Amino acid sequence: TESDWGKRCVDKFDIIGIIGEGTYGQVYKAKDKDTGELVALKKVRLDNEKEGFPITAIREIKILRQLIHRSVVNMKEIVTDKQDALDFKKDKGAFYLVFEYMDHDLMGLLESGLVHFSEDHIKSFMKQLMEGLEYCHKKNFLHRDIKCSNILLNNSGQIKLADFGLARLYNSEESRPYTNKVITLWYRPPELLLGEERYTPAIDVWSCGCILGELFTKKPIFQANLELAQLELISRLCGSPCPAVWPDVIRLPYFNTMKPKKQYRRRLREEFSFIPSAALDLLDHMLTLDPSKRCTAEQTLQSDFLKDVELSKMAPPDLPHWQDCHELW
Amino acid sequence: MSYNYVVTAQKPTAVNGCVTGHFTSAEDLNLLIAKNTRLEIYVVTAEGLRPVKEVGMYGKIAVMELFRPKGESKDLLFILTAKYNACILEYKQSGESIDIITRAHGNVQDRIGRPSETGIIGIIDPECRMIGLRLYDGLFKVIPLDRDNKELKAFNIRLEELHVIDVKFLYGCQAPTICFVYQDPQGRHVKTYEVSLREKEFNKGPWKQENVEAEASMVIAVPEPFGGAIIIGQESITYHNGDKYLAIAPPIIKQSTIVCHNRVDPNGSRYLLGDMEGRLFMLLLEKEEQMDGTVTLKDLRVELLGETSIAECLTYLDNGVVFVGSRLGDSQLVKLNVDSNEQGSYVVAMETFTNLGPIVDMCVVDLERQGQGQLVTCSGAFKEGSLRIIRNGQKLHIRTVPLYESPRKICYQEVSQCFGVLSSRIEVQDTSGGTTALRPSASTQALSSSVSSSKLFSSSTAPHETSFGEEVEVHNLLIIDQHTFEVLHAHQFLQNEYALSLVSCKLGKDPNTYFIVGTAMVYPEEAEPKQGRIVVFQYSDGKLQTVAEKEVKGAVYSMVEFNGKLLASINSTVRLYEWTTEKELRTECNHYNNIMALYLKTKGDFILVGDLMRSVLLLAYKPMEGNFEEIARDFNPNWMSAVEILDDDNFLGAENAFNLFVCQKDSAATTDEERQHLQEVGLFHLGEFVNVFCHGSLVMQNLGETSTPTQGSVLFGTVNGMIGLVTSLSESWYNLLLDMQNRLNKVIKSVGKIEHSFWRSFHTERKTEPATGFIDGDLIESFLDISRPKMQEVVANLQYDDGSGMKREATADDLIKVVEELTRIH
Amino acid sequence: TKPCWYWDKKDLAHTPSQLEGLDPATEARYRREGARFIFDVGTRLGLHYDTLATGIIYFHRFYMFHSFKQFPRYVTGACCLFLAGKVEETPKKCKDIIKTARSLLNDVQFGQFGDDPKEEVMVLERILLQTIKFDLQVEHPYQFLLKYAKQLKGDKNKIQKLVQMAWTFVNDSLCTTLSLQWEPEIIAVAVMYLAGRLCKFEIQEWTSKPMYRRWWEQFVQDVPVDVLEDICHQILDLYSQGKQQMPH
Numbered sequence A: 001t002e003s004d005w006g007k008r009c010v011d012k013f014d015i016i017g018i019i020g021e022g023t024y025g026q027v028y029k030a031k032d033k034d035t036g037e038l039v040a041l042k043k044v045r046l047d048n049e050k051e052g053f054p055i056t057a058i059r060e061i062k063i064l065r066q067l068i069h070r071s072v073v074n075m076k077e078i079v080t081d082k083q084d085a086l087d088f089k090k091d092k093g094a095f096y097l098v099f100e101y102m103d104h105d106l107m108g109l110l111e112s113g114l115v116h117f118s119e120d121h122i123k124s125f126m127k128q129l130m131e132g133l134e135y136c137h138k139k140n141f142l143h144r145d146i147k148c149s150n151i152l153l154n155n156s157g158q159i160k161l162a163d164f165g166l167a168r169l170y171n172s173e174e175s176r177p178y179t180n181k182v183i184t185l186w187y188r189p190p191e192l193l194l195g196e197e198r199y200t201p202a203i204d205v206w207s208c209g210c211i212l213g214e215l216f217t218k219k220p221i222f223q224a225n226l227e228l229a230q231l232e233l234i235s236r237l238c239g240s241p242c243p244a245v246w247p248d249v250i251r252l253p254y255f256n257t258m259k260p261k262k263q264y265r266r267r268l269r270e271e272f273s274f275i276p277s278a279a280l281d282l283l284d285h286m287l288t289l290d291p292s293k294r295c296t297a298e299q300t301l302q303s304d305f306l307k308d309v310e311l312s313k314m315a316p317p318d319l320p321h322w323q324d325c326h327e328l329w
Numbered sequence B: 001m002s003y004n005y006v007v008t009a010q011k012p013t014a015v016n017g018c019v020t021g022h023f024t025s026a027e028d029l030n031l032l033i034a035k036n037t038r039l040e041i042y043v044v045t046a047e048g049l050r051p052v053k054e055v056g057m058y059g060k061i062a063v064m065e066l067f068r069p070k071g072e073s074k075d076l077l078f079i080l081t082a083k084y085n086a087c088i089l090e091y092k093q094s095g096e097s098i099d100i101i102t103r104a105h106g107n108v109q110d111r112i113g114r115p116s117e118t119g120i121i122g123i124i125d126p127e128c129r130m131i132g133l134r135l136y137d138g139l140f141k142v143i144p145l146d147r148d149n150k151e152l153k154a155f156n157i158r159l160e161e162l163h164v165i166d167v168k169f170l171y172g173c174q175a176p177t178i179c180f181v182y183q184d185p186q187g188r189h190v191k192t193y194e195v196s197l198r199e200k201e202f203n204k205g206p207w208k209q210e211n212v213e214a215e216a217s218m219v220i221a222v223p224e225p226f227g228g229a230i231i232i233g234q235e236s237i238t239y240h241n242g243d244k245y246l247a248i249a250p251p252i253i254k255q256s257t258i259v260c261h262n263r264v265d266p267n268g269s270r271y272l273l274g275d276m277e278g279r280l281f282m283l284l285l286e287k288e289e290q291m292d293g294t295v296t297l298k299d300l301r302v303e304l305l306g307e308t309s310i311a312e313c314l315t316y317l318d319n320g321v322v323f324v325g326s327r328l329g330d331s332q333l334v335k336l337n338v339d340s341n342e343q344g345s346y347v348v349a350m351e352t353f354t355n356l357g358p359i360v361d362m363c364v365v366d367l368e369r370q371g372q373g374q375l376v377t378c379s380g381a382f383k384e385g386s387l388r389i390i391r392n393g394q395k396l397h398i399r400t401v402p403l404y405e406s407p408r409k410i411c412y413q414e415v416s417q418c419f420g421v422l423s424s425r426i427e428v429q430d431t432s433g434g435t436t437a438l439r440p441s442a443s444t445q446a447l448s449s450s451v452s453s454s455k456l457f458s459s460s461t462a463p464h465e466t467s468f469g470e471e472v473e474v475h476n477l478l479i480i481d482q483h484t485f486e487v488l489h490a491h492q493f494l495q496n497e498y499a500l501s502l503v504s505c506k507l508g509k510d511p512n513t514y515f516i517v518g519t520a521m522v523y524p525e526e527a528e529p530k531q532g533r534i535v536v537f538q539y540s541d542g543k544l545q546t547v548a549e550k551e552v553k554g555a556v557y558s559m560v561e562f563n564g565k566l567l568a569s570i571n572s573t574v575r576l577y578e579w580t581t582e583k584e585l586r587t588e589c590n591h592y593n594n595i596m597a598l599y600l601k602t603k604g605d606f607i608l609v610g611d612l613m614r615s616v617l618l619l620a621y622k623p624m625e626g627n628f629e630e631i632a633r634d635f636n637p638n639w640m641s642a643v644e645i646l647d648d649d650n651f652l653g654a655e656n657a658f659n660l661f662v663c664q665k666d667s668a669a670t671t672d673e674e675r676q677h678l679q680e681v682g683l684f685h686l687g688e689f690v691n692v693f694c695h696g697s698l699v700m701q702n703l704g705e706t707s708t709p710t711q712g713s714v715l716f717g718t719v720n721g722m723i724g725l726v727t728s729l730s731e732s733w734y735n736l737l738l739d740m741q742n743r744l745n746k747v748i749k750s751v752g753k754i755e756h757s758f759w760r761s762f763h764t765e766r767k768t769e770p771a772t773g774f775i776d777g778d779l780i781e782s783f784l785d786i787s788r789p790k791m792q793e794v795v796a797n798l799q800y801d802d803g804s805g806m807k808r809e810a811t812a813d814d815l816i817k818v819v820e821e822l823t824r825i826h
Numbered sequence C: 001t002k003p004c005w006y007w008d009k010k011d012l013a014h015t016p017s018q019l020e021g022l023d024p025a026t027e028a029r030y031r032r033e034g035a036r037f038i039f040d041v042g043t044r045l046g047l048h049y050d051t052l053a054t055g056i057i058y059f060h061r062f063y064m065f066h067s068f069k070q071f072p073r074y075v076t077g078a079c080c081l082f083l084a085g086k087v088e089e090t091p092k093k094c095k096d097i098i099k100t101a102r103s104l105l106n107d108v109q110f111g112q113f114g115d116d117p118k119e120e121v122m123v124l125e126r127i128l129l130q131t132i133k134f135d136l137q138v139e140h141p142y143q144f145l146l147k148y149a150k151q152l153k154g155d156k157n158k159i160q161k162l163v164q165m166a167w168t169f170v171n172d173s174l175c176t177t178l179s180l181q182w183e184p185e186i187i188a189v190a191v192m193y194l195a196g197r198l199c200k201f202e203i204q205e206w207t208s209k210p211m212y213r214r215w216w217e218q219f220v221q222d223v224p225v226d227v228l229e230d231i232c233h234q235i236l237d238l239y240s241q242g243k244q245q246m247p248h
């Protein structure tokens, strides 16, 4: 049956190439021999056998077989190398996680400078992203690594979230100890810079807000190399963490340790005065310092910016593919 | 890691901007010409220009303007680089000693902002109270020009109009006032605002908004005798001042797009206008004095003067002389006469300044057998198109071969003593239903000619409607003699067929040497071409014959010969074809993991692929198996302009952001993932757009001419005409030259006080990384031009390594010999 | 889409082990020992109750597809717990599971781990994952016992006694094949039903529908008493066979 995973062989896919270096193994583009469907295979290596199957892949197998949303990538199945060993002890073959192939990733589109997003594109993009994030948050899952690389985009304009290797369950009742440094610094929330370890699902909202801003500048907002400098950049824009705007900031471990040069005032609306108002309000609320005052995913969908976006009229990005080959004089 | 060296053989020749004024002395008339990273200062004589000084800057010159604030005897210069380095400069001369003073300096980049579509704009107030900069959408940056702002610190005013086309500071206003054409969903509009330094905001402007031509392109600030502004479009010119509104729409300007404007008469009576077909116009302001004593603008008139080179910038010097600064063709000095000549023209040519123009492609051939080597370049665009033969005979000797059409790719066939050049010319849909060329050109002046008869796409049934006046490209293969450069033959490709790739090779067991062209069927409807052909030609006995054609389902962007087989990139696919005994192409193997395979290079059984967004991929042919294998891919997202193979392990690439990088196989085989990673090992900001990498040198190296520390010779051509050389170094030689750079940067004074380390830092809108693995040869070759006190200062405490003597001190004279050796590679 | 993990009691006479000559009593014994081994090792390691149950469910499912004579049970158990820890985010190092396994097993039993205990366990993970068809997410009777108990309103002491007794019945049911016969939701109801009968409580009165004598129907649709009683019969059989008695 379709459900009997782990048995079908990777012979069933013609490997096209390598689409990236992954955490537990390389990711390959491939074509299904039977159906012709283009897929993506993530290689899982148990040959290290320090801790057997890596947990990063276990989380992605556990969570993505539960999550069914248009803006959440679908794991189609899991296939294996020809074992070629009667004895299971000898077998060191790897496992491949089958996923739907996505034509592009946001980082690739923005980094090459090849795309332009109009307001209506950003609306369609952010509605899908935040709807998917809502589905996940309502299911008590935290992505914990939202970055432009992890946001896949099909040429039609469909957005799918895809790197659930650092994703874990969230309980609003029992606060649990967690791994503090879980997001990329450019997209990391101020709470995780000051070391909450008791992070809320509003860590993922901060990341998406950085992307919202980035889609309007074509450049990331808080680009830094070290944790303190990021807090400085965030503070220059959002204001310095102070108990007046974030009363529980004093409880965070590194609040006294890590301090910005000044107690900066918030200038987010001034430095983003070139953004539409509906979006500026979305950005201002998403980039709120206090995670308990930061907006939820649902609240973003019930905003003037995204409320009335109709996703039937999806908006493909510009994605020029001709006459960019030869530059115009 | 890897160690490489980049030197500039020919400096940028394209004119990026020109201004006039009184910069060197309050008395002299100056002409400042800006080429990418280079500033040339001239003095205007009765015969021509007298050069006085040339400086380099560690930045691309984006803004260049002369101004004279109250209290100064002479004009000062503002230059803003494309990396947002701002400065105010002064000329100072002490007898024979000429130097450039940095009066103020600063970087005006904002942490947050969206770069504007129409690029950086810089303007200065007529009272020199402020410098205006339009860097980002929705913001106006005002630098106060007070004696106290030497850090050039500035403030941003919020601008409601997000899409600004052009802006100027207007004349004759009670307060500093700006006139800007902007675009919103309702069309284009002209609007005015006043600028308050005291309030640091905009106040309501003097004259009302008028909605203007949809393609309104340029704003002219007319001087006080008239006041107000002129707006130049595609079809009409309009003057707006207060309630006064004029509009002239002469049919002559509708023909070609107007790109530049300059003021002839300081009163504003006469302005010069230029268009993309080289036509030079005179715009005339017809005055009318009322009894009030007031002078009003009565009417506008446009008069055609003649033809110049397609010009980026124009400047009127004095008497009848105008300087035509060209980016696409040779810059010129032309004299305007009051009486027309017998052909009806008022423009006569005085001087021609060589511009290698956009170097679209190039080939290195030893045509004269001098053992040296010569460079034939595909240079120029449109009517300014030419082939340029360059030899390193101390200057570069440059022969020019005018084509009057755009050259695209060049290859050399020695068996036939000729060159193959792909070209495209512009024809316009005419009343016949066909098209008519604007001027005769190489593809029409060939001795013999042919037109493709292929019926591959002739089934059509796909409608493409034509409107009279629309442009089309007509693509040709030109056969050009290597000695006379006579166009011996020209083959016109099918309608709507673009020629993209050319190779001269022998294939398989075929004795005949062929010309192979790759094409793409381009329709204005298609996002990516879906039809194309690879056609084989034989140039024999003065006629080109059509040996065979292969239909492909895409554009063949690049073709390269692979050990008697044909390697071609069709859209995302990389393919290897075999040449059969039946003289047809047969596919052997394919590779499909590409977004768009734009560039191909080979070495042995290894192939380097250049992608639109996925950087560089090393692919290998497995002869035992008859297929392709992916050896290693670079996973950093870069938009490629050209790729080259340096050696079996190092690979060179050029980014669309004016950056260079080198990738090496990890050469450590602990894991399969490590091998399949191309590690960015060298990063460098060149400052030029590299279209072509070509292996070779123009220097004479046979029969014992002394070789150098550097190994290899890759020549590169760029859009601004710069030609350069990339070569490799040993670890020991790099560290010596790198340590010396750090010493030279502390000693050498930069124009604008721009940090050299900053200038060469890898730079995109999203990244800035410090340079790695590359030695700026132009810094090294500058050691020979610094004064002796400075030379000895540089060599203090300098130690060599990995040599006959592990640690050896350096004297100034030792390095003078080393650098002089390095001057021989270029 | 998703696999089916439930069989009929009658189907358990045709397990791989039964067909290799193992009798029903012996396989039942092996199942209890393996489950209790998983429970005891993990309790010593401080593992959450869900982590213990997930390992036990992996164990029970495994021996519906393989024979006890070819896969030593305490190795299988240790491997299940090791994987369960990674699935449920309560991870343990394999060496630590082996260490604890030695303490609780006699020398003959630890012989099943062969010359290299860690290797025998780590190697089995590949077979475990393929056997469980990579369906790692499991739901357990505990969450439903609490979800349903939260909707009961009444004497706190009387309801808490119901919950704890039922909770004990859940822990006990992990030693049986009930995990392979009935969804967890039904198990939670069944144990509530059993505790009520034993405590002489009428749970109907604490529900939102006090005259709905079939109170479980508002939590689990389509469950006949036939089922809830078969489950009760199976749970109490463990107590009667053993020397242990109902908790009350």
Ligand SMILES: O=C(CCn1cnc2ccccc2c1=O)Nc1ccc(Br)cn1
Residues within 6 Å of the ligand: A018, A019, A020, A027, A040, A073, A099, A100, A101, A102, A103, A104, A105, A108, A152, A162, B614, B633, B634, B635
């Ligand atoms: O990575 C993509 C988008 C295309 N892409 C992105 N980066 C590349 C880098 C190098 C070479 C090719 C590619 C390339 O083709 N899609 C994807 C990723 C994970 C899953 Br699961 C499903 N789809």
